Design a protein that fits this description.
Chain A: Keywords: Cytoplasm, Cytoskeleton, Microtubule. The structure is cut from a larger assembly and holds 1 copy of chain A, 2 copies of chain B, 1 copy of chain C and 1 copy of chain D. By secondary structure, chain A is mainly alpha-helical. Chain A has 11 helices and 2 strands, in the order αααββαααααααα. Chain A is elongated, with a radius of gyration of 27 Å. The radius of gyration of chain D is 29 Å and the shape is elongated. The chains are: A mainly alpha, B mainly alpha, C mainly alpha, D mainly alpha. At the B-D interface, helix 1, helix 2, helix 3, helix 4 and helix 8 of B face helix 2, helix 4, helix 6, helix 7 and helix 8 of D.
């Protein structure tokens, strides 16, 4: 009826709303494994009692997964119950029976957990002590370039044949580097003064770059460079401006501290204090 | 979606995105075309338009609103105008981005909502941050030179977009202070009435020490005070 | 229609299989001239009789050259 | 005949639900596999539901008819300050409509003040006002002769607010002579470094051009002016 | 293992269009990887069963990169050069 008809046609309306799914099907064993296995199960007499599933097709899984991987969630599939990922069990296609399926979506949910912990931290930036801000900036710069790939592949669904095993395999050298961040960030989740909490995180990066002393090392390198960036500024400020930096004791020098600047530290102190003794002269 | 999203984000909201004064922009929930997949992207998209409407209301509120004076001075004066004028100059790439979005919509309108979210993620961090600076400026009814200190303190952060954006507004507000300083040191005349510019020979030309900005030492204020008192004397 | 195009898709497949078999036997016929010979083969034909004419006109495309 | 038809190209979209020759139909297009048409359909349905739940008194603002370019030209004509049909002299269109109507109401109160041919400083003040009116006339219809509706609201954000300040500048008695000469003087010092500074400076520079000639008479010729 | 990934994509790309292909095509087509995988299986199970994590892992690699069948003869040659490449940072920081 002129609005509802266009809605009905050019919007699916069958895996997110109360409506049984329809799609023209190509039967005959080579793509019919779910229905074949269903009939086999019933013939062996379980006795019957089916599984509550609404029959969703193949590509809808692909679109829903891409949105889960991009960084958003709370879709119709893959909801949270306390902030823990959970797979819907009403999914089954006219093939694969949903036994391999529950497992492949379990791996995708496991990566969604890794992105959920990060988004919880990043959202609580807005409701941050200039090193945490410079750390958030590194995470954010990763997230934009990372979100690009997931949007760009979703464009090719609107164009082209696409299946699951290509887009899973394609994201292996991206989900690999993400797990390294899941382990570096766990030490910054482990937690004192905020500068002690910052040193406990910051020393992990300085250790992790020498661990691979490639592509992981350039990532950890770029995460390192943007977080010692406040400190190089403030030590230069102590040298030329002749005063110790006050940031509610955000500064690592005692006048709790990493091994980065330790082998040259006496040359920092012996320059800053001597400049301060020139300010009084 | 096509005209509506740009219309809502630009600050001319409708009935899909009902503007509230207590939640900003908000979609009217479940429809038989709106479903939980696109919903989260929509909710994240609403924040930009919320902050934008607040910004433009504030800019209109404190720019061009008097004709040389009710009689309050915390709700009037040159520094409020200068802040709103600087914020209007900073907001230009958001408007430009929405223009380019419409051009791509015309070329093909089958662009998903997450695509627009992907382009506008660089304003997605910048808009919630600056909102508390401008909100504190309104709520605390700030008077005199303390506006400069308030924005200078938040330009010490570790997020480059936010820091650069607030620093430009502080430069705009420096413009007015330099303009009154061109008068008091050179003759002694004031230009800014009822709002402080950290300076008033002797008394009726003395230094007001307390209001002085935090990036300026007291020593240079003594030097300025000498120049003004002496040029007034001879 | 649509079911008249799925059949024609299944005919496009078959024509490409016959195209492989045509190219490994290295017939001088390209994709266009072969599409005349398949229409002839649909109406019934003796390809010994077509082959005797094609073996002469291919030697008489180079006789007046 | 099969071969006359055959010389096409098959679709690249295919599924493992569709192995027996899909000619391309889809898995039923998603919401954003349609746009700028389906847009108007759900906006029309939402508006109809609103009109039902109210009683038809909620007043649909352009439910369909008219389209974009005609509405753009109507939006443009209000900035010329002359008569329109739904502005002062989808359903998000009312919110844009009110802002463009309020742009036109402050445009009109300047041409109304500049049809005059009070003193000599009054005519100089008005002749300075038209120097901004010309920039505004150059801004509209040259940049958007038919171009997109939202570009109007963005283009006259920096300029419509300034024009609305100029509406408060004009009286619509208003001062004249030395009274006006001190009025505009206080306008200089109150707004001395802003976006409103050079326009007010050009106003003050020429609104005293009669006054200096008045001062130049009784001293230099002994005859009062 | 990347040519074991590509050789799985090719099959699915065939099956999307082709209706009559069956189990025998996969069993047939992946018969060359029933030579690579069982013969590198003994190398990996040798390194797990008696645990090797020294530099004598490389000698045990050079015993099976001799091969005798071409897949297990040429596969380990890729790996050994990368191992020496990490030792060429060790032996340059030495030298």
């Amino acid at each position: 009826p002129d609005d509802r008809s266009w809605l009905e046609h050019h919007v699916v309306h069958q895996y997110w709303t109360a409506r049984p799914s329809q799609f023209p099907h190509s039967l005959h064993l080579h793509s019919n494994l779910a229905a074949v296995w269903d009939q086999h199960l019933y013939s062996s007499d379980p006795l019957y009692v089916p599984d509550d599933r609404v029959l969703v097709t193949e590509t809808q899984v692909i679109r829903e997964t891409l949105w889960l991987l991009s960084g958003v969630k709370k879709l119709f599939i893959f909801q949270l119950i306390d902030g823990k990922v959970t797979v819907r069990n009403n999914i089954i296609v006219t093939h694969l029976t949903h036994s391999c399926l529950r497992s492949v979506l379990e791996q995708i949910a496991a990566y969604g957990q890794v992105v959920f912990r990060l988004q919880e931290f990043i959202d609580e930036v807005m409701g941050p002590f200039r090193t945490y801000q410079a750390f958030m900036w590194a995470l954010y710069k990763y997230f934009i370039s990372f979100k690009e790939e997931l949007a760009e592949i979703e464009k090719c669904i609107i164009n082209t044949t696409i299946t699951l095993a290509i887009v899973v395999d394609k994201l292996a050298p991206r989900l690999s580097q993400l797990k390294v961040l899941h382990k570096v960030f766990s030490t910054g989740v482990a937690e004192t003064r905020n500068v002690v909490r910052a040193s406990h995180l910051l020393n992990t990066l300085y250790k992790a770059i020498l661990e691979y002393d490639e592509q992981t090392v350039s990532l950890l390198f770029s995460l390192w460079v943007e977080t010692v960036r406040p400190y190089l500024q403030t030590v230069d400020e102590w040298i030329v401006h002749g005063h110790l930096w006050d940031g509610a004791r955000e500064f690592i020098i005692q006048r709790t501290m990493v091994s980065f600047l330790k082998p040259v530290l006496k040359q920092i102190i012996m320059a800053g204090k001597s400049m301060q003794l020139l300010k009084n002269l | 979606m096509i005209h509506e999203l740009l219309l809502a984000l630009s600050g001319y909201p409708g009935s899909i995105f009902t503007w509230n004064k207590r939640s900003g922009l908000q979609v009217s929930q479940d429809f038989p075309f709106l479903h939980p997949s696109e919903t989260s992207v929509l909710n994240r998209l609403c924040r930009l338009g919320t902050d934008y409407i607040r910004f433009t209301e504030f800019i209109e509120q404190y720019t061009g609103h008097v004709q040389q004076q009710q009689g309050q001075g915390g709700l009037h004066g040159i520094y409020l105008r200068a802040f709103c004028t600087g914020l209007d100059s900073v907001l230009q790439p958001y408007r430009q981005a929405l223009l380019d979005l419409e051009q791509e919509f015309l070329g093909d309108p089958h662009l998903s909502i997450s695509h627009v979210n992907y382009f506008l993620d660089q304003f997605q961090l910048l808009f919630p941050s600056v909102m508390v600076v401008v909100e504190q400026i309104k709520s605390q009814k700030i008077h005199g030179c303390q506006i400069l200190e308030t924005v200078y303190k938040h330009s010490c952060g570790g997020l480059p977009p936010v820091r650069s954006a607030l620093e430009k507004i502080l430069a705009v507000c420096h413009g007015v202070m330099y303009k009154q300083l061109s008068a008091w040191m050179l003759h002694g005349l004031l230009l800014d009435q009822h709002e402080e510019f950290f300076i008033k020979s002797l008394k009726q030309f003395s230094l007001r020490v307390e209001i002085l900005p935090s990036y300026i030492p007291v020593r240079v204020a003594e030097k300025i005070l000498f120049v003004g008192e002496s040029v007034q004397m001879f | 229609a649509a079911a008249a195009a799925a059949n024609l898709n299944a005919v496009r497949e078959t024509m490409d299989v016959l195209l492989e078999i045509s190219r490994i036997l290295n017939t001088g016929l390209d994709m266009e001239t072969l599409s005349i010979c398949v229409r002839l083969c649909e109406q019934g034909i003796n390809p010994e009789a077509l082959s005797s004419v094609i073996k002469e006109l291919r030697k008489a495309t180079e006789a007046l050259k | 005949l099969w071969e006359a038809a055959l010389t096409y190209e098959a679709s690249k979209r295919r599924c493992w639900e569709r192995v027996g020759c899909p000619p391309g139909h889809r898995e039923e297009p998603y919401l954003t596999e349609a746009g700028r048409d389906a847009f108007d359909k759900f906006c029309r349905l939402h508006q109809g539901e609103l009109q039902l739940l109210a009683g038809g008194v909620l007043q649909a603002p352009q439910p369909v008819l008219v389209k974009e370019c005609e509405l753009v030209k109507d939006v443009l004509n209000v900035l010329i300050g002359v008569v329109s049909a739904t502005f002062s002299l989808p359903e998000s269109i009312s919110s844009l409509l009110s802002e463009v109507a309020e742009y036109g109401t402050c445009y009109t109160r300047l041409s109304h003040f500049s049809l005059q041919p009070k003193g000599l400083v009054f005519q100089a003040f008005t002749s300075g006002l038209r120097r901004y009116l010309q920039y505004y006339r150059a801004c509209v219809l040259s940049t958007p002769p038919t171009l997109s509706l939202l570009t109007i609201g963005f283009l006259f954000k920096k300029l419509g607010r300034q024009l609305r300040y100029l509406a408060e500048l004009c009286g619509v008695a208003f001062p004249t002579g030395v009274k006006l000469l001190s009025y505009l003087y206080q306008e200089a010092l109150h707004n001395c470094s802003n976006e409103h500074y050079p326009v007010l400076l050009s106003l003050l520079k020429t609104s005293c051009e009669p006054y200096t000639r008045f001062i130049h008479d009784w001293v230099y010729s002994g005859v009062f002016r």
